Design a protein around this nucleic acid. Structure first.
Ligand code: MG
Length: 134
DNA sequence: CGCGAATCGCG
DNA sequence: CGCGAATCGCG
């Protein structure tokens, strides 16, 4: 399997797990930042990776793009394909925002179709995913 | 730490 | 038993 350069790559920047979560989607070839989510005060890295893929799906659908999405998160890929984010993070006032976003992302997946292939980025083969926060 | 996958205890 | 609940490997 080889890299598809004409694609979008996503990744999360965490400050702790759980902790502050941000993410972005970038052009795999050029590194152009296509979308970003500002820091969410608490969430898990998995939740952020799930949100990043769904945001990518929404972005690509709006643009009618057929580009695939790369994620380095096998867990988040599974959650998206299952249309169910199996997170164990407690639901309280503190975690209300991340859960609101996850619930809405699930709702989007359950009420839309999409053409975008969702592919696993192979870090051991290909090095850092282009959206890495470093 | 949080995950999915793989590996006890009570009814 | 056998079955859900509770407890390695990675990133
Ligand atoms: Mg990540």
């Amino acid at each position: 399997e080889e890299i598809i350069w004409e694609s979008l790559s996503v990744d999360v920047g965490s400050q702790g797990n759980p902790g502050i979560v941000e993410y972005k989607g970038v052009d795999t070839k050029t590194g152009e930042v296509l979308f970003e989510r500002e820091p969410i005060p608490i969430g898990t890295n998995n939740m952020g990776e799930f949100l990043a893929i769904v945001h990518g799906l929404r972005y690509l659908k709006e643009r009618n793009s057929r580009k695939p999405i790369y994620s380095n998160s096998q867990t988040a890929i599974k959650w998206v394909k299952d249309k169910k984010a199996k997170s164990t993070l407690v639901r309280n006032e503190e975690t209300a925002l991340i859960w609101k976003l996850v619930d809405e992302a699930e709702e989007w997946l359950n009420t839309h179709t999409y053409e975008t292939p969702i592919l696993k980025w192979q870090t051991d083969k290909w090095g850092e995913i282009k959206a890495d926060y470093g």
